[PDB]
């Protein structure tokens, strides 16, 4: 608090308040007894749960047939009207466009439209699979996805 | 007619203004204006001014008669209280209010 200990009574003799302080947390000034600050919110989670998840989640998309392996979905040039048609013609939307492969025009163009974001095989996580229902990967991507995970 | 009337920010003791609504509540006009000016209180000549203005709208704002106007509803609501202090004494002060009203006359049809 930016306050001080100055005491708003001179002990009993008067009965305005039993509080000795204006640095109380119950004051108009306030203070709050368990005030927020820097706190940690990061959990461990084992590497075998991590893999473990992306294996059950993998083998859940398969059972819900929504995992798509299509190749050469890389884009020749920045212009997202080419990355529109790539999904569209294959009647896809809500995609990840997840590959370990390097095409930078593909990372750049994926940033526009908020129903797709930049995803990589090496960058893989749960939440991104789960939300963005169609799941798009090259023959090379899957081969690498095996070693990375299991 | 139906016309309202307020004098807002009347400085005047409000329990006393309530007394003088009653005095002429529902007893026509043109003698209810006379009573106030020939009775007690300067609450009389404060609600009086509100009264003759209510009437004056019941004239000019439609009307043309004081012959068929009865002072149907007359009240007064508690108005914004004027905060002040009183040095009461011996190192004690108190918020002391200059209590107030919204004098409301509402003449209508007789």
């Amino acid at each position: 608090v930016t306050g001080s200990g100055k005491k708003p009574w001179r002990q009993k003799g008067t009965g305005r308040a039993r509080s000795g302080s204006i640095k109380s947390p119950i004051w108009r000034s306030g203070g709050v007894t368990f005030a927020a600050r820097p706190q940690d919110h990061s959990q461990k989670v084992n590497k075998k749960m991590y893999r473990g998840a992306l294996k059950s989640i993998l083998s859940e998309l398969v059972r819900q047939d929504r995992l798509i392996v299509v190749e050469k979905f890389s884009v020749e040039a920045p212009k997202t009207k080419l990355l529109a048609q790539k999904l569209k013609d294959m009647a896809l939307e809500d995609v990840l466009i997840i590959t370990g492969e390097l095409d930078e025009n593909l990372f750049l163009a994926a940033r526009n439209l908020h129903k797709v974001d930049v995803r990589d095989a090496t960058g893989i996580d749960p939440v991104s699979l789960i939300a963005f229902d169609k799941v798009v990967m090259t023959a090379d991507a899957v081969k690498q996805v095996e070693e990375m995970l299991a | 007619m139906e016309t309202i009337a307020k004098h807002r920010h009347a400085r005047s003791s409000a329990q006393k203004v309530r007394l003088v609504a009653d005095l002429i509540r529902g007893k026509k006009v043109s003698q209810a204006l006379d009573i106030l000016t020939y009775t007690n209180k300067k609450a009389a000549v404060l609600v009086k001014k509100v009264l003759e203005s209510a009437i004056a709208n019941a004239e000019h704002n439609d009307g043309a008669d004081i012959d068929d106007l009865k002072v149907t509803k007359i009240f007064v609501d508690e108005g914004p209280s004027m905060k002040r202090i009183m040095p009461r004494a011996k190192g004690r002060a108190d918020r002391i209010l200059k209590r107030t009203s919204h004098i409301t006359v509402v003449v209508s049809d007789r």
């Binding site: 708003p8 009574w9 008067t14 | 011996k90 004690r92 002060a93």
Partner: peptide
């Protein structure tokens, strides 16, 4: 429309204990 109002904290005691 100015305002000034303090708080008071001074004693009203003057009377003395019964039966010590």
């Amino acid at each position: 429309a100015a305002a000034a109002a303090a708080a008071a904290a001074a004693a009203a005691a003057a009377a003395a204990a019964a039966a010590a």
